[PDB]
């Protein structure tokens with residue numbers, strides 16, 4: 207049972223350690239691009255969220271890197287687009303070079319951003335492909351996202367989200383909410399909107415994830431929260447590949463998995479509910495919660511609970527039924543897709 | 547038999563205005579603001595009308611110590627020679643340099659300190675041993691925070707200060723992140739500290755005339771308390787229902803430190819706060835005998 211899941215986790219771990227050289231090459235290109243973006247008046251304030259130089263969206267693709275370059279906005283003014291809760295318009299300004307009226311243009315900023323990188327990479331066989339920019343290094347992928355940074359308090363749409371109060375405590379929720387939030391240019395299908403991003407909060411939670419501060423720092427306190435998440439992400443990625451030729455799994459992403467996972471951490475706040483010896487049942491409970499979300503068509507954003515990731519306006523019912531059928535098959539046959 | 551200690555805590559439970567706002571100092575050059583951003587501190591639990599405020603100044607340094615481990619020389623900036631204000635505030639104190647300009651008909655002891663965002667000095671490498679208590683990740687995080695330099699005589703020196711870390715630990719003090727946020731998880735760590743501070747303050751007043759207790763401070767009490775928290779890392783060893791024994795164990799640890807002449811700095815372990823060089827054994831023995839008398843007699847000093 208769990209021995210099979212553990213074998214999967216061991217090969218997933220080994221596959222992601224052998225990236226030393228690649229990681230170096232990414233750091234090199236990133237340092238180059240940030241130094242050069244800074245030569246422009248608009249981008250002098252660019253920088254890495256944390257001096258973490260990279261992340262991986264797909265657990266099964268260690269050669270595919272993801273980085274975010276952030277840019278601080280001194281006094282940002284947000285205005286909600288069409289009642290979406292997650293999509294906003296952004297309103298002596300080093301970005302006045304891109305204001306189309308009182309609105310900051312996602313199209314203008316990205317065009318300049320893409321030009322500097324294209325030019326800077328024309329100076330290691332690196333090619334640009336049109337996540338603002340995707341770079342192909344040698345024949346290593348690097349996705350670069352541009353985000354605005356705001357140190358103002360979080361938008362009211364997040365007021366009832368991040369319900370980690372019975373898990374990570376009320377004190378942590380307050381401290382987390384004093385941190386900046388980010389905006390990424392993103393078409394609200396309108397093209398000039400920006401989407402809220404709390405990716406940096408999710409990272410701090412996953413790496414400081416127990417009620418006990420010493421959770422996973424000793425043998426007595428080993429939990430399987432991170433193992434369960436990894437197994438859920440790998441499940442989706444493998445199914446997305448088998449049917450990459452079909453349209454049914456195109457709208458599903460690792461964001462859906464993480465959101466469902468955080469919701470189960472809220473439901474199961476005690477470390478004793480995530481004991482490593484119970485990897486099998488904990489995983490099965492995470493799969494079951496995710497399936498319940500697919501059948502009832504409900505997956506609330508962890509930070510914005512009024513935004514339903516699984517509504518019929520985003521993903522049709524047939525796609526959710528197809529995914530449900532595939533995961534249920536895998537669950538009843540001890541996940542053969544893991545071995546494929 | 548802890549019902550008396552609870553009565554004391556209720557008494558200690560039963561309109562700050564800072565002037566600190568003056569802004570006026572910002573109208574100068576060298577001056578730079580409050581360390582307790584948005585928060586007013588009470589060095590003495592028994593003195594609600596005695597306030598302690600700290601002003602901080604950022605300094606992007608070349609510290610040099612002798613082997614004091616705590617006293618250093620601070621080697622476009624808005625003095626020199628090795629770096630060395632009261633007159634500034636004198637327009638709008640013998641304890642070394644801090645506090646200074648104590649000031650309100652209510653005292654506001656103001657300390658001015660330098661802020662460094664450089665790594666902590668090597669002398670602190672083996673201190674802050676909260677790893678089995680608050681965890682390794684909290685130790686690492688806390689050590690990425692700034693440290694402060696307070697003017698204090700060791701010629702002219704500056705002394706390290708970690709009072710802002712002690713604050714963050716005291717207000718986030720359990721193994722569980724939800725320690726004291728629900729009925730199931732109420733501990734008595736803060737109450738034990740308050741009772742230890744009150745005991746020292748009440749005895750420092752009884753023997754105000756004598757010189758035996760002149761060198762003892764709330765700092766000694768807090769340092770001993772933190773060591774007790776390190777020795778007893780689990781929330782279950784601090785259960786609120788056991789206030790009586792937890793307090794008694796804190797008093798005992800402090801007494802062991804006095805008898806053995808050994809109280810290490812929590813941040814700088816090689817700095818002995820209770821060495822014979824700083825405090826005479828007869829002062830430590832005098833305090834020991836007064837504390838033991840108080841423990842044997844249900845703390846009359848609290849009455």
Ligand SMILES: *C1=[C@](*)(*)[C@](*)(*)=[C@](*)(*)[C@@]2(*)=C1(*)C(*)(*)(=O)O(*)C2(*)(*)C1(*)(*)=C([O])N(C2=NC3=C(Cl)C(Cl)=[C][C]=C3[N]2)N=C1[C]
Pocket residue numbers: 589598615616644645655657696705706707708709765811813814817
């Ligand atoms: C000034 C104003 C308010 C309280 C105090 C002072 C002061 O200097 O005495 C206390 C005080 C104090 O002595 N300390 C110490 N910090 C410290 C360190 Cl970091 C080392 Cl390594 C050795 C000795 C001490 N004493 N902190 C305060 C608040």
Ligand SMILES: *O=[C@]1(*)O(*)C(*)(*)(C2(*)=C([C])[N]N(C3=NC4=C(Cl)C(Cl)=[C][C]=C4[N]3)C2=O)C2(*)(*)(*)=[C@](*)(*)[C@](*)(*)=[C]C(*)=C12(*)(*)*
Pocket residue numbers: 263264272337349351439442443444446447458459460461
């Ligand atoms: O805007 C962006 O969306 C996110 C993003 C998350 C979060 N997850 N994905 C994602 N998962 C995934 C899988 Cl499991 C497979 Cl098999 C294939 C492709 C994806 N994508 C996201 O795209 C994101 C991440 C980086 C940059 C921009 C975004």
Ligand SMILES: [Zn+2]
Pocket residue numbers: 415416421422427428429430431
């Ligand atoms: Zn854990």
Ligand SMILES: [Zn+2]
Pocket residue numbers: 719720725726731732733734735
């Ligand atoms: Zn507590």
